[PDB]
Amino acid sequence: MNGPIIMTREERMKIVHEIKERILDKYGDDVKAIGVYGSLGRQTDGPYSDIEMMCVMSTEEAEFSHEWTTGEWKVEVNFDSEEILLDYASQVESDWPLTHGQFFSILPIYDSGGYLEKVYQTAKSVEAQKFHDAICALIVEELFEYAGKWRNIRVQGPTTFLPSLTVQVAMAGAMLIGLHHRICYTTSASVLTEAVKQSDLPSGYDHLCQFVMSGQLSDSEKLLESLENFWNGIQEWTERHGYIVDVSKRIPF
Amino acid sequence: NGPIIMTREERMKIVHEIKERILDKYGDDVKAIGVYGSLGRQTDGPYSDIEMMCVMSTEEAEFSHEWTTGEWKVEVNFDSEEILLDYASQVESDWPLTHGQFFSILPIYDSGGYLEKVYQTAKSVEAQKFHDAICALIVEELFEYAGKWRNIRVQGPTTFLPSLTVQVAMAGAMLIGLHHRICYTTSASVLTEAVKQSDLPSGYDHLCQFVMSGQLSDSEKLLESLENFWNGIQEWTERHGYIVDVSKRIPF
Ligand SMILES: NC[C@@H]1O[C@H](O[C@H]2[C@@H](O)[C@H](O[C@@H]3[C@@H](O)[C@H](N)C[C@H](N)[C@H]3O[C@H]3O[C@H](CN)[C@@H](O)[C@H](O)[C@H]3N)O[C@@H]2CO)[C@H](N)[C@@H](O)[C@@H]1O
Ligand SMILES: NC[C@@H]1O[C@H](O[C@H]2[C@@H](O)[C@H](O[C@@H]3[C@@H](O)[C@H](N)C[C@H](N)[C@H]3O[C@H]3O[C@H](CN)[C@@H](O)[C@H](O)[C@H]3N)O[C@@H]2CO)[C@H](N)[C@@H](O)[C@@H]1O
Ligand SMILES: Nc1ncnc2c1ncn2[C@@H]1O[C@H](COP(=O)(O)CP(=O)(O)OP(=O)(O)O)[C@@H](O)[C@H]1O
Ligand SMILES: Nc1ncnc2c1ncn2[C@@H]1O[C@H](COP(=O)(O)CP(=O)(O)OP(=O)(O)O)[C@@H](O)[C@H]1O
Ligand SMILES: [Mg+2]
Ligand SMILES: [Mg+2]
Numbered sequence: 001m002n003g004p005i006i007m008t009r010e011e012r013m014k015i016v017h018e019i020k021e022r023i024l025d026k027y028g029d030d031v032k033a034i035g036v037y038g039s040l041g042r043q044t045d046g047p048y049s050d051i052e053m054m055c056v057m058s059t060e061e062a063e064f065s066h067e068w069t070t071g072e073w074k075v076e077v078n079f080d081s082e083e084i085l086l087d088y089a090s091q092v093e094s095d096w097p098l099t100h101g102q103f104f105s106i107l108p109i110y111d112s113g114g115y116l117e118k119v120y121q122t123a124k125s126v127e128a129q130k131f132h133d134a135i136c137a138l139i140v141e142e143l144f145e146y147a148g149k150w151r152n153i154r155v156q157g158p159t160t161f162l163p164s165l166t167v168q169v170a171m172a173g174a175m176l177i178g179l180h181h182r183i184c185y186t187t188s189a190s191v192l193t194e195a196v197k198q199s200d201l202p203s204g205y206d207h208l209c210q211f212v213m214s215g216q217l218s219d220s221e222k223l224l225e226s227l228e229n230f231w232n233g234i235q236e237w238t239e240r241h242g243y244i245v246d247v248s249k250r251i252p253f
Numbered sequence: 254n255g256p257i258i259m260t261r262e263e264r265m266k267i268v269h270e271i272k273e274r275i276l277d278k279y280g281d282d283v284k285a286i287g288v289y290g291s292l293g294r295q296t297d298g299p300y301s302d303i304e305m306m307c308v309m310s311t312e313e314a315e316f317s318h319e320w321t322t323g324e325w326k327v328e329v330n331f332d333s334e335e336i337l338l339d340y341a342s343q344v345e346s347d348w349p350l351t352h353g354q355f356f357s358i359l360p361i362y363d364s365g366g367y368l369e370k371v372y373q374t375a376k377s378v379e380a381q382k383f384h385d386a387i388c389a390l391i392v393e394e395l396f397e398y399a400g401k402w403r404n405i406r407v408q409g410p411t412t413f414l415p416s417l418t419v420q421v422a423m424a425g426a427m428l429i430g431l432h433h434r435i436c437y438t439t440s441a442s443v444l445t446e447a448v449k450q451s452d453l454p455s456g457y458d459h460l461c462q463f464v465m466s467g468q469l470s471d472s473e474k475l476l477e478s479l480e481n482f483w484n485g486i487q488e489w490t491e492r493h494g495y496i497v498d499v500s501k502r503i504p505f
């Protein structure tokens with residue numbers, strides 16, 4: 001295969017409706033709804049964009065996907081029962097701002113009973129405690145661990161890992177901001193650009209992203225200084241907004 | 254103040270305190286306790302964290318405790334024997350990054366060779382699972398990455414190119430690790446160990462130099478390096494028989 005080729009929006013929609021016809025032929029009355037998400041669902045797909053579709057099934061324990069390429073383009077179709085999809089849409093993980101824009105993206109092509117609207121309503125009505133818990137977990141599970149990794153790099157290397165680690169920290173900060181503002185990023189390319197347009201950023205985040213977005217990640221000393229400043233801004237930011245975790249016990253169970 | 258400097262001896266004081274707490278709370282439901290990660294290999298650095306794994310007799314047991322004291326951080330995983338053995342034999346795209354855990358285990362408590370059984374399962378995974386994982390990685394990740402950087406070339410934004418290049422270099426390291434059935438030591442050594450492997454895809458080493466040095470500001474040279482690597486993938490997969498099915502427009 002020659003990799004992804006240039007395709008028009010008209011050609012991608014022709015593939016979508018061919019897939020819709022095959023889905024309806026194969027699964028029949030078990031198909032509750034079919035939608036397009038991603039850049040094609042918003043009709044902002046570029047020349048090399050891929051195709052992603054979702055399907056709501058009546059069958060229980062239905063949870064499978066077909067993801068393939070023809071050599072020229074690539075398609076991903078997810079099949080989930082209504083209960084599995086609604087449960088997934090109301091769970092807030094650390095990468096929620098990156099995954100759950102799909103449920104604010106849906107272009108319905110087939111819907112037998114407002115199922116896609118019910119999915120959208122569920123995803124947008126998640127109670128605030130779930131975001132609070134996810135933010136506190138993100139600090140412990142990812143950010144604290146990253147700080148140990150770059151502090152280890154400072155004292156024992158290797159600096160060849162620092163550029164990759166810096167990108168990962170900037171992405172983790174984008175998740176932190178996305179959970180706080182309850183915004184889902186449009187595409188992977190817009191994660192950092194949209195994260196730095198949000199108000200009330202932790203101190204040092206925008207400066208750190210400037211290194212990552214510009215690609216100037218060769219000055220290891222300035223990166224470590226930028227990472228520590230971001231880490232300091234995190235601790236001030238979390239206390240100011242009340243994302244406080246009790247850390248007083250050596251063993252909390 | 255973030256993670257503080259700690260010695261290996263101090264980390265082993267914490268490991269054995271947690272072991273006693275696990276045995277007191279869960280009692281006879283504990284089959285085995287081990288340390289993995291850098292502490293399990295006894296190569297932990299001054300700021301390294303602590304990760305432990307526990308084998309439980311309780312059916313469907315699958316939970317974790319992950320916390321910080323403000324000075325250090327600990328993660329303890331609790332899994333039933335069946336859940337752990339199934340996970341140890343399952344090969345995902347990030348297998349070379351995740352499953353070194355099962356080649357790291359420092360046993361602390363074991364009532365019946367359970368940690369050794371997990372180790373045997375992880376090292377005896379069927380070769381076909383790596384073949385399938387490689388083909389899936391190409392379709393699900395690398396092909397998607399190629400579309401993203403080709404979109405960047407024609408419409409931007411180049412502000413995503415440095416992060417995307419890091420992700421492609423990491424994916425290529427997973428590809429090499431899956432082919433050689435090797436698990437990387439730590440996340441910091443993934444790229445350095447990946448370029449020391451024999452039979453790399455053409456263009457991979459050149460792409461990794463940009464990522465390891467941090468020189469990711471030349472968007473034109475990065476896009477050229479990415480295309481060469483992408484071209485080298487097709488020669489590489491054909492050479493090893495990692496053939497991707499492209500015959501169906503709709504494969505269901
Ligand atoms: N434990 C055995 C198996 O683990 C799986 O989860 C795997 C994976 O999702 C999970 O990843 C978890 C995350 O989720 C969680 N939100 C934060 C946590 N730090 C992270 O932990 C993992 O990633 C860290 C680096 N970022 C590593 O330092 C750490 O040692 C590693 N356990 O760790 C597990 C592998 O170690 C499944 N739970 C289940 O199939 C089974 O229980
Ligand atoms: N479908 C609803 C839910 O999706 C979950 O999976 C989520 C996630 O793991 C999964 O990620 C899958 C991977 O796995 C698979 N190995 C490659 C595939 N490209 C990727 O797809 C996802 O990541 C891509 C970006 N790299 C996106 O382009 C794509 O739109 C997105 N669906 O996509 C889902 C979120 O979009 C669970 N399967 C299940 O809880 C339930 O089915
Ligand atoms: N790593 C990720 N994992 C899961 N979903 C993601 C994701 N990154 C982005 N998304 C969500 O899944 C949708 C499609 O993801 P992608 O195909 O990776 C980029 P896109 O938004 O479709 O534009 P593009 O493919 O033309 O570049 C996004 O619109 C977004 O809602
Ligand atoms: N994303 C990931 N998911 C699951 N396991 C991972 C993982 N990344 C690395 N690992 C596994 O979990 C172990 C511990 O991971 P980490 O704590 O993140 C780095 P380490 O190997 O312990 O050295 P360090 O903590 O001193 O930096 C790794 O050795 C590896 O076996
Ligand atoms: Mg897309
Ligand atoms: Mg996609």
Ligand SMILES: [Mg+2]
Pocket residue numbers: 290291292301302303304
């Ligand atoms: Mg560790």
Ligand SMILES: [Mg+2]
Pocket residue numbers: 145290302303304328
């Ligand atoms: Mg760890």
